[PDB]
C-alpha cells in the first residue's frame, strides 16, 4: 500500500521507451492478448541500452 | 449511416498496379480498425491486412507483404476518410472481389462491409462476342455466348418479351483469356416451327450489340 | 517461449506516417526524427552456433522537423523553434513497442516477424502504471459480539 | 497456433427446419451469412451473442471447443453460406439447399452449328436440366475414350419453385475427331435417375 506513485517522466516517443524504469526480474513482453495482432506488444528490458543522440 | 461505398470494379494487365478505394462517412471514424478481405473465385474469404485510421500504419500477412500497400487519407476535420489499396505487381491469380470491412470491437467482428470491388487482370481488351445458335431437331433450346470481354453480357428472348423458363449459366473463363456462356430456354414442342425465336445480347463495355434468329 | 516452434525474425516499418516509421523524440525544443533500421531486423533460426564479431557503432541518420503535430487531431499543431547552438542527448532505452505481423493459414514456414513502432500513445504510460490501482477505503464494519449496550433506566 | 475446422459443408433441409452447424476453434468466434457474391453479414458474435438487426431464429452454443450456430423454422430465404471466423483465419462455409427434391437430370445434347466450324472451333455440350443433388459425375466419351481437361462445367442457380438445378458442361475437342465419326453421347449417372439416360440426335 502507498499514498502515492514513484516519479513518472512524461517523456513522449514513438519506438523505444526512453528514460523508463527497469524491470527488476528479467525481460517482460506484456499484451493486451498475445494471439491478437491488433493489439500491441511491450517487451521491458532489466538492463537499458544507451543511445547517444 | 455507415456507408462503406467502395469504388467500382478494375480490368487491367498482369504486371500493372490497380488502387481499390473505399469511403467512410458516418461514425467516429478514428477510433476502429479498418480491415481488407479478398475473395477468390467460388472460395472463401481471405485476410490481406488491417489499417489503423489514426497513424495509417498497415500490418499485413508473409505473402501479400512487399506488394500490397494501405493507405488512408482523411478530410480536413477527419469526418470523411479514404482507404485505398494499391496492389502492385498484379498477377495471374490476382482475380478476386474485395472488401473493406470494419472492425468493431475485440473480438474481431466485422458489423459493416463494402459492397466491392471486382478487380481482374489479363490481356484481350474488351472487344466483340461471337453468338452461335443451336439447332433444333416441352423441350429447351438457347443461344452461346463467346469470346466476349469483360463481363457482362445478357442475353434477351424475342427483345425482352420471353423470359420465362431462361436458365442463363454462370460465365467461365476458358484458357484462352475470354469469357463464354450458353443461354436456354423451355418451349412447348409445338412451338417449334411455328414461332419466331430470337436471342438478343447487349455487351455495354465493348458497346456491341447482337440479336440473332435460331431456326432449325 | 510464448512462440514455441517458431523462429523469430525483426523487420524494419512497413510504412505510416512520419511518427511510427522513425523513432521520434525530443532534446531541448528540437524534434529528432530517427530512422533505426539497422537496429531492427535478422532472424535467428535455432541458435545453432554463437557467433563472434568484433566491436561496432551503430549509426542512425535523423531528421529534424519543425511544423510538430504531436497528436493528431486533439493537440494544437505547433511550430518548434530553432535551438541555438550544438545539441546533445544521452538517453536510455528500457523498452520496446512491437507489433506483430498477421498470419496466414495455407502456409506458415515458422516464422514470426515483429516489426517496431506501434500503438498508440496511451502505452508509453501503460509502461509505469502497470502496478498500481486505486482503491476507496470503507472503513465501517459490522460483525457481531457478546456485549450489548447498557440500556439507561 | 489457431486451428479451426467447419462442417462438410453439404446439408440440406426443407422449409421450416431446424439446423445447426458446428466448429471447433480455440479463440473469439463469429458467425457470419454470406449470399452468392454478396457482402456477407454479421449474424452472431462471441460464440452466441446476437446482433441487433438479426431475426430471432439464430442462437449460439458454448460448449467445450464446439460452437453450435443454430438457426430454427427455416425461411426460402435462408439458403445461403454460413462460416465461422476467427481472427485472421476463415474457414470456406457450409452449403445450404433444400432435401428430399431428388429427380431424373432431363438429358439434352446440341451438336456444333454448321457456322461454328467455319471459324475452326469445335464446342460440344450435353444439357442437364432438373437434377438434384447439384454434385453430379459427367464423364465425356469419344468412341468410349475419356477426355480430360478440355471440359467446362457449371450449374445454374436453385430456382424458386422447382428447386432443382441445371447443368451445362461444354466440350471441347480438335476439328479432326468431331467430323471423322458421327455417333457421340454425353451419358451421366446420377442418384435422381434410375436408368442411364442419353440423348442423341439424328444428322438430317
Ligand atoms: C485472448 O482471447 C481468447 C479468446 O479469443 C481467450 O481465450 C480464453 O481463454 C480462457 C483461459 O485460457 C478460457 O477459459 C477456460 O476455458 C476452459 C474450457 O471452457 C469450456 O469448458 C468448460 C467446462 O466444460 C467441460 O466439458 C467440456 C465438454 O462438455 C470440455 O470440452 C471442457 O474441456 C471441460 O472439461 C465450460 O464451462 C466452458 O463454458 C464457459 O462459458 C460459458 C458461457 O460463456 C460459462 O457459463 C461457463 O461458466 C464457462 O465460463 C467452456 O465450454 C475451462 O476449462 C477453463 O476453466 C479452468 O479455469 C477455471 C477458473 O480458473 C477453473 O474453475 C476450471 O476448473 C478450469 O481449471 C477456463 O474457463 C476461455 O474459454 C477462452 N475463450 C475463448 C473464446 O477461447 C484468452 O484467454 C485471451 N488471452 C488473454 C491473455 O486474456
Ligand atoms: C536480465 O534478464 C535476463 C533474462 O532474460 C537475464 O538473463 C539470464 O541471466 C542468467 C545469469 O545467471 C543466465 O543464467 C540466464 O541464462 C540468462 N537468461 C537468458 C534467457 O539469457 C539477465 O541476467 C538479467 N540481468 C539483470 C542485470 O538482471
Ligand atoms: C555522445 O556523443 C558525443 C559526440 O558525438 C561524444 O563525445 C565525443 O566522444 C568521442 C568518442 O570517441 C570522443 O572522441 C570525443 O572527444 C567526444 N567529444 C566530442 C566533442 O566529440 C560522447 O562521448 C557520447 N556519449 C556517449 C555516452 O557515448
Ligand atoms: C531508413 O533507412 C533505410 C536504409 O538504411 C531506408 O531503406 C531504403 O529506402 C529506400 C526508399 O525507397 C529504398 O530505395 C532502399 O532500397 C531502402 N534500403 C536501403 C538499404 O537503402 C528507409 O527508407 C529509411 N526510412 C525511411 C522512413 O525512409
Ligand atoms: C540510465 O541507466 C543507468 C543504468 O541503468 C542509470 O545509472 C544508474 O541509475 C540508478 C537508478 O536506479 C542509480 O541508482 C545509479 O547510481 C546509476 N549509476 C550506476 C552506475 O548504477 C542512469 O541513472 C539512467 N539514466 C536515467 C536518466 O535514468
Ligand atoms: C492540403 O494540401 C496538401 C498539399 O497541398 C494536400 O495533400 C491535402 O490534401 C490538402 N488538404 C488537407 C485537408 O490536408
Ligand atoms: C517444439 O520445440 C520443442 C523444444 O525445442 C521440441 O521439443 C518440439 O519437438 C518442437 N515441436 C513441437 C511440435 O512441439
Ligand atoms: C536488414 O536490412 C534489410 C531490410 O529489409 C534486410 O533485407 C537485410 O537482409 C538486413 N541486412 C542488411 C545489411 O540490409
Ligand atoms: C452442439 O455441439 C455439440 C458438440 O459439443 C454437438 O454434439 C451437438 O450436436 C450440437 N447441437 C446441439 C443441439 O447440441
Known amino acids: 500500500s502507498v499514498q502515492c506513485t514513484h516519479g513518472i517522466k512524461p517523456v513522449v516517443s514513438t519506438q523505444l521507451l526512453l528514460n523508463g524504469s527497469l524491470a527488476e526480474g528479467e525481460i517482460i513482453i506484456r499484451s493486451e492478448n498475445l494471439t491478437n495482432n491488433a493489439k500491441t506488444i511491450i517487451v521491458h528490458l532489466n538492463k537499458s541500452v544507451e543511445i547517444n543522440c | 449511416q455507415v456507408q462503406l461505398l467502395q469504388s467500382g470494379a478494375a480490368v487491367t494487365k498482369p504486371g500493372a498496379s490497380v488502387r481499390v478505394s473505399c469511403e467512410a462517412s458516418g461514425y467516429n471514424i478514428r477510433d476502429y480498425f479498418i480491415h481488407w478481405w479478398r475473395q477468390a473465385p467460388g472460395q472463401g474469404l481471405q485476410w490481406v491486412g488491417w489499417i489503423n485510421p489514426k497513424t495509417g500504419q498497415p500490418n499485413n500477412p508473409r505473402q501479400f507483404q512487399g506488394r500490397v500497400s494501405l493507405t488512408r487519407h482523411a478530410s480536413w476535420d477527419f469526418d470523411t476518410y479514404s482507404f485505398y489499396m494499391d496492389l502492385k505487381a498484379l498477377r495471374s491469380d490476382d482475380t478476386a472481389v474485395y472488401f473493406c470491412?470494419?472492425?468493431?470491437?475485440?473480438?474481431?467482428?466485422?458489423?459493416?462491409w463494402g459492397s466491392g470491388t471486382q478487380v481482374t487482370v489479363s490481356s484481350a481488351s474488351t472487344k466483340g462476342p461471337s453468338v452461335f445458335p443451336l439447332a433444333p431437331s416441352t423441350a429447351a433450346l438457347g443461344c452461346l455466348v463467346k469470346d466476349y470481354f469483360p463481363e457482362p453480357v445478357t442475353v434477351s428472348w424475342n427483345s425482352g418479351a420471353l423470359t420465362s423458363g431462361v436458365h442463363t449459366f454462370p460465365a467461365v473463363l476458358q484458357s484462352s483469356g475470354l469469357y463464354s456462356l450458353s443461354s436456354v430456354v423451355t418451349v412447348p414442342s409445338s412451338s417449334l416451327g411455328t414461332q419466331t425465336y430470337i436471342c438478343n445480347v447487349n455487351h455495354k463495355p465493348s458497346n456491341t450489340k447482337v440479336d440473332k434468329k435460331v431456326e432449325p | 517461449e510464448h512462440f514455441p516452434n517458431k523462429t523469430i525474425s525483426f523487420q524494419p516499418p512497413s510504412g505510416g506516417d512520419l511518427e511510427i516509421t522513425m523513432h521520434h523524440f525530443n532534446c531541448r525544443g528540437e524534434f529528432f526524427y530517427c530512422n533505426t533500421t539497422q537496429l531492427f531486423n535478422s532472424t535467428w533460426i535455432n541458435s545453432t552456433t554463437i557467433k563472434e564479431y568484433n566491436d561496432t557503432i551503430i549509426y542512425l541518420p535523423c531528421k529534424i522537423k519543425q511544423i510538430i503535430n504531436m497528436w493528431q487531431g486533439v493537440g494544437q499543431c505547433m511550430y518548434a523553434p530553432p535551438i541555438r547552438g550544438k545539441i546533445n542527448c544521452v538517453s536510455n532505452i528500457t523498452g520496446i513497442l512491437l507489433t506483430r505481423d498477421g498470419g496466414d493459414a495455407n502456409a506458415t514456414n515458422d516464422t514470426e516477424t515483429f516489426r517496431p513502432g506501434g500503438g498508440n500513445i496511451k502505452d508509453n504510460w501503460r509502461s509505469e502504471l502497470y502496478k498500481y490501482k486505486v482503491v476507496q477505503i470503507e472503513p465501517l464494519g459490522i460483525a457481531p459480539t457478546k456485549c450489548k449496550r447498557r440500556v439507561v433506566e | 497456433d489457431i486451428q479451426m475446422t467447419q462442417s462438410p459443408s453439404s446439408l440440406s433441409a426443407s422449409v421450416g427446419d431446424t439446423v445447426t452447424i458446428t466448429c471447433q476453434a480455440n479463440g473469439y468466434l463469429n458467425w457470419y451469412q454470406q449470399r452468392r457474391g454478396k457482402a456477407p453479414k454479421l449474424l452472431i458474435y462471441d460464440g452466441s451473442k446476437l446482433e441487433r438487426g438479426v431475426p430471432s431464429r439464430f442462437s449460439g452454443r458454448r460448449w467445450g471447443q464446439e460452437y453450435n450456430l443454430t438457426i430454427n423454422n427455416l425461411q426460402p430465404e435462408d439458403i445461403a453460406t454460413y462460416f465461422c471466423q476467427v481472427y485472421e483465419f476463415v474457414v470456406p462455409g457450409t452449403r445450404l439447399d433444400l432435401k428430399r427434391t431428388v429427380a431424373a437430370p432431363s438429358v439434352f445434347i446440341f451438336p456444333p452449328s454448321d457456322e461454328q466450324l467455319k471459324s475452326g472451333t469445335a464446342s460440344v455440350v450435353c444439357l442437364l436440366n432438373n437434377f438434384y443433388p447439384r454434385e453430379a459425375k459427367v464423364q465425356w466419351k469419344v468412341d468410349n475414350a475419356l477426355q480430360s481437361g478440355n471440359s467446362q462445367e457449371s450449374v445454374t442457380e436453385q430456382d424458386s419453385k422447382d428447386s432443382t438445378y441445371s447443368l451445362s458442361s461444354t466440350l471441347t475437342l480438335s476439328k479432326a475427331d468431331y467430323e471423322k465419326h458421327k455417333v457421340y453421347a454425353c451419358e451421366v449417372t446420377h442418384q435422381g435417375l434410375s436408368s442411364p439416360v442419353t440423348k442423341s440426335f439424328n444428322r438430317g
Open positions: 470491412a470494419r472492425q468493431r470491437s475485440d473480438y474481431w467482428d466485422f458489423d459493416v
